[PDB]
Amino acid sequence: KLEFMEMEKEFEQIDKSGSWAAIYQDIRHEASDFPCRVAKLPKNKNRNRYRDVSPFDHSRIKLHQEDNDYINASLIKMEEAQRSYILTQGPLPNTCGHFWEMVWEQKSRGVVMLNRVMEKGSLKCAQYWPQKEEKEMIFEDTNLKLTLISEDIKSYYTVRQLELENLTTQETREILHFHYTTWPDFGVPESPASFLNFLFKVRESGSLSPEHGPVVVHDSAGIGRSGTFCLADTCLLLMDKRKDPSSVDIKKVLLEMRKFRMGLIQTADQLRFSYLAVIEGAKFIMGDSSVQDQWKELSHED
């Protein structure tokens, strides 16, 4: 029979009335406000890409190595869902060593990049990983070596296998890089299918496993596209744990995530897209496995 999920009925009411902007601004109005004193210290000015996007002190990731422990990155710890994410800005030319130090120290297995290095004529992220196997990168400040092992290029995203080595202990780890290359700044994915096909690739890699440290997610500021990716993933995980779409309150989950980093989801259309992604993803969560193959085809990755 036909049965609308509660979220589908809410989506339709909002769409019909054209109230996405109002719904979104209300979330902005109710969002948490916490201090970012460390982010604002004079010595950290050059460690921040945007003066208006900073990590709260209570949830910021601290680098381990007495000199300066600051990186613009936040731990989004979703207690009910039991999954954590580190959301961070695209690293700067002087913070690529810090970025990989954070990946090492936090034991992350995957890095999710949702932007291109150049967008709208400006450099939104440093070229922080090696583009050629034979041109490995050594971060002198943090003593790490990063090598490109292989890459699988699809039409709108690429997955790279990287080797990160702590030169101090000579221990090495495989880091998976998931790079979404067709998601515009302040925009939305081409379709729920393209987005979900990508999120499922990250999921299938095992990078979100609780056995690993938190996946690192970023775009340029690390709040819009990054927020959309984590909101959709957490909502789908909550639905999955309970096998009940009705126990999922998307706006409530977003406000919970905003307790850990400011400005997650930057436009009303990103919020609308998040609903679309969760509604479509619910089909797979609730047992229609065949939809994953459908997304792969509609995504036109090949």
Residues at the interface with Mg ion (CB under 5 A): 58
Task: Please state the closest distance from residue 131 (CB atom) to Cl ion, in A.
Answer: 9
Using an 8 Å Cβ cutoff, are 285 and 237 in contact? no
Nearest to 179 by CA among 113, 132, 124: 113
Tell me which of 38, 123, 255, 286 binds Cl ion, using CB under 5 A.
123
Which is nearer to Cl ion, 143 or 158 (by Cβ)?
A: 158
Which is nearer to Cl ion, 9 or 120 (by Cβ)?
A: 120
Task: Please state the closest distance from residue 107 (CB atom) to Cl ion, in A.
Answer: 26
Instruction: Residue 184: name its binding partner from Mg ion, Cl ion, none (Cβ under 5 to 8 Å by kind).
Output: Cl ion
Tell me which of 18, 42, 210, 287 binds Cl ion, using CB under 5 A.
42
Task: Please state the closest distance from residue 106 (CB atom) to Mg ion, in A.
Answer: 16
Tell me which of 21, 22, 41, 167 binds Cl ion, using CB under 5 A.
41
Whole-number Å distance between alpha carbons of 17 and 15: 5
38 belongs to the binding site for Cl ion (CB under 5 A): no
Task: Please state the closest distance from residue 13 (CB atom) to Mg ion, in A.
Answer: 37
Tell me which of 166, 173, 263, 298 binds Cl ion, using CB under 5 A.
263
In the block, tokens 């731990």 appear at 75
Tell me which of 13, 167, 171, 184 binds Cl ion, using CB under 5 A.
184
Tell me which of 117, 255, 276, 298 binds Cl ion, using CB under 5 A.
117
Which is nearer to Cl ion, 87 or 282 (by Cβ)?
A: 87
119 belongs to the binding site for Cl ion (CB under 5 A): yes
Task: Please state the closest distance from residue 3 (CB atom) to Cl ion, in A.
Answer: 34
Q: What is the 3-state secondary structure (H, E, C) of the chain?
A: CCCCCHHHHHHHHHHHHCCHHHHHHHHHHHCCCCCCCCCCCHHHHHHCCCCCCCCCHHHEEECCCCCCCEEEEEEEEECCCCEEEEEECCCCCCCHHHHHHHHHHHCCCEEEECCCCEECCEECCCCCCCCCCCCCEEECCCCEEEEEEEEEECCCEEEEEEEEEECCCCEEEEEEEEEECCCCCCCCCCCHHHHHHHHHHHHHCCCCCCCCCCEEEECCCCCCHHHHHHHHHHHHHHHHHHCCHHHCCHHHHHHHHCCCCCCCCCCHHHHHHHHHHHHHHHHHHCCCCCHHHHHHHHHCCC
Classify the phi-psi angles of 129: left when phi > 0, otherwise alpha if psi is within -120 to 50, otherwise beta.
Answer: beta
Which is nearer to Mg ion, 100 or 195 (by Cβ)?
A: 100
219 belongs to the binding site for Cl ion (CB under 5 A): no
Interacting positions 76-105 with Cl ion (CB under 5 A) = none
Whole-number Å distance between alpha carbons of 48 and 175: 24
Residue 47: both structure tokens together: 């460690």
**Per CB under 5 A, which region of 38-46, 78-86, 207-215, 280-288 contacts Cl ion?**
38-46
Number of amino acids touching Cl ion (CB under 5 A): 13
Which is nearer to Cl ion, 98 or 116 (by Cβ)?
A: 116
Task: Please state the closest distance from residue 274 (CB atom) to Cl ion, in A.
Answer: 14
185 belongs to the binding site for Cl ion (CB under 5 A): yes
Task: Please state the closest distance from residue 164 (CB atom) to Mg ion, in A.
Answer: 11
- Residues within the interface to Cl ion (CB under 5 A): 28, 41-43, 116-117, 119, 121, 123, 126, 184-185, 263
